[PDB]
Amino acid sequence: QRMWWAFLASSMVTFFGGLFIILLWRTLKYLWTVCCVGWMTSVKDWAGVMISAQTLTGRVLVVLVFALSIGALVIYFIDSSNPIESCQNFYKDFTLQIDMAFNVFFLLYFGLRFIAANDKLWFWLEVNSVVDFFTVPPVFVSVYLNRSWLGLRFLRALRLIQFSEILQFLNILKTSNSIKLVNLLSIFISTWLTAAGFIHLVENSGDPWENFQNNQALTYWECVYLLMVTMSTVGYGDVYAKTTLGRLFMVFFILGGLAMFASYVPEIIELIGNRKKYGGSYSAVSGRKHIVVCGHIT
Amino acid sequence: VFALSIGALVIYFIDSSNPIESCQNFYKDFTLQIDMAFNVFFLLYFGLRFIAANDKLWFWLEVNSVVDFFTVPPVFVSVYLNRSWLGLRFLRALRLIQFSEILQFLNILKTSNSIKLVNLLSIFISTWLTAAGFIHLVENSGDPWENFQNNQALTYWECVYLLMVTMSTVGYGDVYAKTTLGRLFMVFFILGGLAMFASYVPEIIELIGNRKKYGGSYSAVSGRKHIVVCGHITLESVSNFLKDFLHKDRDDVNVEIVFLHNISPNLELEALFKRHFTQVEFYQGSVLNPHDLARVKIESADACLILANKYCADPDAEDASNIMRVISIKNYHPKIRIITQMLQYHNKAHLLNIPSWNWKEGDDAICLAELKLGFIAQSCLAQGLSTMLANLFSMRSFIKIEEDTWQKYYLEGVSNEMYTEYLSSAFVGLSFPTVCELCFVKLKLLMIAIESRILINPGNHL
Amino acid sequence: VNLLSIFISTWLTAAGFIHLVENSGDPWENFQNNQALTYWECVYLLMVTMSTVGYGDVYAKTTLGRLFMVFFILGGLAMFASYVPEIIELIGNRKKYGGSYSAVSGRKHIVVCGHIT
Amino acid sequence: FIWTSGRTSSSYRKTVTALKAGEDKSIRLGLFLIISGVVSLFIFGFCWLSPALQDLQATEANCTVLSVQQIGEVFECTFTCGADCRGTSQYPCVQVYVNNSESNSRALLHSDEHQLLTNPKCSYIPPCKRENQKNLESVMNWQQYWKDEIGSQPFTCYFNQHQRPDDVLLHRTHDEIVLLHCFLWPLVTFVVGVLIVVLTICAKSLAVKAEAMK
Amino acid sequence: RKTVTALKAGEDKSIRLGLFLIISGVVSLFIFGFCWLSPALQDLQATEANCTVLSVQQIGEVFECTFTCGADCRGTSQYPCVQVYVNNSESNSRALLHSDEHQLLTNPKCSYIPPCKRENQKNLESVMNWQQYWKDEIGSQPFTCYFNQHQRPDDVLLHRTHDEIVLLHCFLWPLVTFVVGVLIVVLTICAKSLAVKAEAMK
């Protein structure tokens, strides 16, 4: 028996049940009018300070988030080399225990950002909330079931979008050029890796109307290379999508990914290399005089 | 018309999965009856547009007339013959060109950006689908000089994918045209379709995503006061203001700061607001707009601060702009405390004639020229007094270094500011000199004055 | 007219040269690696190469053919990228609001001019 | 890149508070789910159309075997061994001919449509298990179990006089469950999208009534 | 001069169309002419002849035909090879008979191919049927045949592979496009110039 749907159901149920609970609470709050500084604000302020880097504990938490995002991405990269669905012992799988701990920390960081949030519904629809709903619940389900599906785990790469924000929190990024460069690099890499993971999932699991018989055995790095070739418009043709869903995804990505590549790669290359050629200072020579000339130089 | 165009396109999409020519019973084919009715409606809509036309010959040569001549008669022939050919039925996709026009008729599309976006999307999609249908027809029916033997069995969606790959210039080579007519069509499409793709896809992506990041409005918090700041907002102006407002030498104030400005903040201002994430909020709007003033909740703000551009090219223009801002804020809410910077003194006199301008309630016009010339005059009574006064306002921490230099002593002196607070009943009934010599080093506090209200250095008789 | 003439003549001449070079093989290979390519096939290959589509169904295989392909990729893509947009801009410069009003018997009409916005 | 990296000489009432922005984002989401559900329904509909008609056009029948025999010829199956390891092994060909309910004439039995399409010249294929001896043993085992089935029990069979004109199948190759899920979950997406819009408008309009009440 | 009303714009669009049809017809004539050139010369260069069979025999070797079964289903079946040799009107020497140019090109080593009908037995039966009908045709009636000493140097055909009707339609309808384009220009100029005379008459 296969269990792929249990992981996916846990994410869908989490995202939409939370959204419906929030909307029902709103509805019923106003409906009570038909029948008819606080500690809440103090904990909201404390959570907002923790979320920012205004304290030592907040800085430690932000650095931990930065490290654990890369850790989870590396864990997904390790798992991407295995079969699509498998049975594996939680008590004897160090990577599953490490993932379990990482997702505990992300659940806690999610809880802190929820408490700190001003508009809950606005928070529930912030995309790094969506990234947590589509990546945290399936880890819990896997650790409970003693089984894993390599399903939507490529969405972990979207965690790189917050890197510039948490670098600005840590008082590291100050200049506009550096901020823009980090933003562009993060968006480019996360988009590339996420799209590669999705096309990897879709190619390795065939079309349902073809009874999953036309699947193509493509590795994650092969899909990454194919996406790079497609984005740059080189189009070698050695590697390409063959399933109907894969090609349907390829068509929608060709509209967005080429505009991203054509826009971001020149701008990144302009932002880098902005070095001053004439820097440094003169070194005096003993026994030889020197003359400084300034004013109208042409 | 809008619905039936999509209906006919969907009918063509269904038929594109069948053989190229076939016999099918009109009395037992629901899709052929539905197509029959759809084409009756298009014949009627054609007749109405013909009657409404001014120049008939101009109408006969309008391309949606041509699209009807190439799509309506063959449906009639098919319904008469009890047979169908998947011939020029892909021209149905050209019906999407009129979508923007009939949306403008229905008073739905009004803005230029939305009209342009709809036009570009319609032209792109209709061109793509029509070209895909034509290459599908040409590939599935081979070359006449090769006796139709070199035909390639390509599905319509396969041809759509091939056209997308060709337009974007990716050119995988997994799917390509093989017939001579198919390649001849490919060569002419490569000239036009790449120029369309290269032009339209960036422009569509620019038209979408034009969202305002700083929208919304401030949400007041019970038990906590907030302050609205407007006027000259820039990275250095906000950075200097926040250093003095949020300094650790004040007591534990939790006044929120809300900025209102009509320019989107640059990346360095957004980073400055992120470094103050729990104490500063920014909202993009105009102080002259009552909607924006309601957005920043200025009716419940504790005060409104209006910073001025001290280095402006036209002091008169800057004063006029600040006067207009004050007028707008007072007009929205007469009972709002307003603190503003005024470059000149005659413009300050102009401003204080406002009916809602109440200096007793706390309206302060900080006149820069007046205060600076007064400070210069006090330096003429005692040299160094301008420095003495200026350092009493700026919030400064103690700074200490091991070097024995004049700077150490100077910084130790600079560490003090002027404050104001109520004093103990244990000092009521004594003389002002007596409480001064008491406070001086026992409490470590120096008094310049007390609240016949404001009295500068009282005598021994008070 | 200048752009169209230069584009077409360059395209056809380059296609003929690559057709000659592909159909007569390499002298160091003793003319044994020749590829039987028709002139129209070479024209299609040149169009595919110029537009940067690069299907790969048809391509040069001889050493001289590839050496010619490398030098043409430098010039022909810059020509295509420059000329095709400029030609497409030059065409289609039609005035949408031309023509003249046609009076209707029994109905009056009013002409409005000046500051129209 | 594409067109010289897009260069070419530079060719080309408000009483509601902050909650308004979260609610407008909730409308957006609910609308996007409505569009997604409808679009995916059409996409899956075009993909399932030919398989579903090729399945529907095949009628159920009652069958009985006329004969079981070998044609003496042999064919390659592929056998597999981890990573990518494969080789080929022979199997002997059986043919089986069967009584038919629509044409009442000879047709050749094919266990399923994948067997028909992988070797239309032959009636059965063994799962390739290394050596030729095990393939022949497994064909002889299936052959003996089919040869004595003479009118024992008219087993049901699937036929299509328009595209399997003298070929017969023992199974449907179209899983009803997989099709059901392909049309159910896009419908669920659409219903969820409607409920999100409805609750967002219900909350938005009740906020105005609860404001005017004060 | 601009006495004509709005009708001027419809008539200038009608001139455009008529000119575009003239250009289309001429361009398509050249395009079809280049595509038909090699097939038409390869057909013209093959002369009509009178033939008689020298012998009918099998070479003992067998070949694959492909047999088909809906969607994409195909497999292969053997057929036995006949060869047939024939008297010739241009070279007066041995040549091998090939029923048509597609048979010559699909298997130039062999004289006939059966339409693949599933099993080998039906292919062999259909070859034996054709073989027996050809073996007794000895001088019975000098059947006409097609030959080309320059590109079918010892090969002979029973049929022309070039349909005259398909070529006729490929050159007729571009000519019709051109004639219609001329008549549209002519009637548009005739209407435009008579409108000026009917205006000056008032």
Ligand SMILES: CC(C)CCC[C@@H](C)[C@H]1CC[C@H]2[C@@H]3CC=C4C[C@@H](O)CC[C@]4(C)[C@H]3CC[C@]12C
């Ligand atoms: C508290 C909320 C967020 C939990 C999220 C819902 C998830 C966890 C729910 C939804 C459907 C549930 C699954 C439904 C069916 C099975 C199969 C059974 O053999 C073990 C339990 C298991 C595997 C359930 C595990 C929990 C589950 C996956």
Ligand SMILES: CC(C)CCC[C@@H](C)[C@H]1CC[C@H]2[C@@H]3CC=C4C[C@@H](O)CC[C@]4(C)[C@H]3CC[C@]12C
């Ligand atoms: C975590 C998921 C599953 C449940 C979400 C909890 C929901 C039902 C509850 C818990 C606390 C509630 C929030 C408490 C405070 C506010 C601030 C007010 O100005 C708007 C409503 C809002 C935002 C409430 C909305 C509903 C709410 C978010």
Ligand SMILES: CC(C)CCC[C@@H](C)[C@H]1CC[C@H]2[C@@H]3CC=C4C[C@@H](O)CC[C@]4(C)[C@H]3CC[C@]12C
């Ligand atoms: C539908 C096809 C078959 C026939 C079209 C009808 C023909 C015969 C007739 C009917 C109505 C006529 C039009 C009626 C009115 C005008 C306006 C006038 O100032 C110039 C002639 C013009 C433009 C006529 C042209 C010819 C015309 C279009």
Ligand SMILES: [Ca+2]
């Ligand atoms: Ca101090």
Ligand SMILES: [K+]
């Ligand atoms: K390219």
Ligand SMILES: [K+]
């Ligand atoms: K390419």
Ligand SMILES: [K+]
């Ligand atoms: K390519």
Ligand SMILES: [K+]
């Ligand atoms: K290629």
Ligand SMILES: [Mg+2]
């Ligand atoms: Mg706040």
